[PDB]
């Protein structure tokens, strides 16, 4: 089941967790650093570095004739700022060690035996460093963003987080050149263009260039050596109003087939977990800007296209290989292959690839009930899988409507005395579901009319609460609140 | 999350001004706070608020009492990264840790 040179199962889990723990911290760090960048004392000082002519270019007038010529002045302004900033940044220090680039599991484990001393760095030291123009490449960019914000340009702080690689199962990750690590930045800038409605990518420090990313970004690491400590997986963007969005999509060219499997977000719990973290750091409400960007991301997910390998089409978010189409699924009518994949080699075969959006999930009559649906009177299955079960599709089903509770709050129950609620739709019209490990006790204590609620199974029935008339909700709520006395 | 005032202060300094210290700091904390595992997996948004809430050199060390006990256990022939795990799991109990290492 597993390769003989792979780490234990506990270690595989410890790495996922450590990866997560490390990730949050880095994202929290970028959040706080984003606040420091908005320092009032800092802005008033950096505002003095931008000539009045350049300030204008950064705020062009709507060119009726061709919007393209105003975006051009914006880019001309940024290029200007990029130049004067290189003059302002007198001293450029190297990273004491590896900066915020990715560390190996071996390095992280040895960080206790190879103790390091750290120079405490506070908010006030960051402000001093930026105003004097002294510091490593990370601090230099962060200051650059501060300057643009001082000129009132919607400029984001971009941070490519590098926690250790949890998909690395090797019991020993070792290495290894400084010039390779720093070929691509961890931090950079993004300026908003009102005229073209696109975020412009700016790197005034490392690659020292400005680019309007469409499909290819010069900032994404390339080459075995450069990706050693820089595996682009989570590119986070922080703005003036304390917003926090995951912008990897713009920088990862093979987001859905390569990057995805490296993210903790490749499964479901990781997708949920990660969404809580970004939420906890997003301190503002959606905006039109967030819609223009979401649109752009949409078009990038359409453009990525079908990958060129079998492993990449495995558990991909938008495509499936004909062989991986489950026995409980079928191709929707009027839909065919989305494309093909030729397995290279002499005895190489061609595989058909389908969009998941054209695959339909079929379910037995019981399975549909678990979704609160029943088969319509005139319905014939779409397939029959043997063990025999008949499977139907969503169109062959109708919404299940449970009887209403009586005036005394009585609920129609099954032979065993329970009511089944697998979807909010299965809750009687005049009732409600009270989910609490104590709800049944509180209800039995009150000796009121109710029904134990089975909401799932064990492989038997799992009671998670009760279903009660809506007018009995308060009484049971009271009892639950004070079960200490029951 | 039973984070002492000392530890929460270090965590906040490290995450705000010295992120390059995250590796040694988190190795130290996740070892002394086993429950941290569940709270990070289950409710990361709480841990996040705690950090945003919290507010000339430093280093991340183990107590001299713990350092000596840990190495004392290692001389029994065990991997240091293992001993550190069990030691802080046995609520810093030397004899309880030895047993969990041998028997367990």
Curated annotation (Swiss-Prot), chain A:
Record keywords, A-Z: Cytoplasm, DNA damage, DNA repair, DNA-binding, Nucleus
Further facts: Present with 876 molecules/cell in log phase SD medium.
Say what the protein does.
Involved in nucleotide excision repair of DNA damaged with UV light, bulky adducts, or cross-linking agents.
Q: Which organism is it from?
A: Saccharomyces cerevisiae (strain ATCC 204508 / S288c)
Domain of life the protein comes from:
Eukaryota
From the Swiss-Prot or TrEMBL record, state where the protein is found: Cytoplasm; Nucleus
Annotated GO CC locations: cytoplasm; cytosol; nucleotide-excision repair factor 2 complex; nucleus; XPC complex
Q: Which family does it belong to?
A: Belongs to the XPC family.
A single MF term (Gene Ontology)? damaged DNA binding
Gene Ontology biological-process annotations: DNA topological change; mismatch repair; negative regulation of transcription by RNA polymerase II; nucleotide-excision repair; nucleotide-excision repair, DNA damage recognition; proteasome-mediated ubiquitin-dependent protein catabolic process
Q: Which residues of the full protein are shown?
A: 126 to 632 of 754
Protein name, entry field: DNA repair protein RAD4
Q: Which residues mediate DNA binding here?
A: 125-144
UniProtKB/Swiss-Prot annotation, chain B:
Protein's recorded name: UV excision repair protein RAD23
Q: How does it assemble?
A: Interacts directly with PNG1.
General function of this protein: Plays a central role both in proteasomal degradation of misfolded proteins and DNA repair. Central component of a complex required to couple deglycosylation and proteasome-mediated degradation of misfolded proteins in the endoplasmic reticulum that are retrotranslocated in the cytosol. Involved in DNA excision repair. May play a part in DNA damage recognition and/or in altering chromatin structure to allow access by damage-processing enzymes.
Covered part of the full sequence, start to end and full length, is 255 to 395 of 398
Origin species: Saccharomyces cerevisiae (strain ATCC 204508 / S288c)
Q: What else is known?
A: Present with 10900 molecules/cell in log phase SD medium.
Q: Where in the sequence is the signal peptide annotated?
A: none
- UBA domain residues are 64-104
What is this organism's lineage?
A: Eukaryota, Fungi, Dikarya, Ascomycota, Saccharomycotina
> Where, subcellularly, is it found?
Nucleus; Cytoplasm
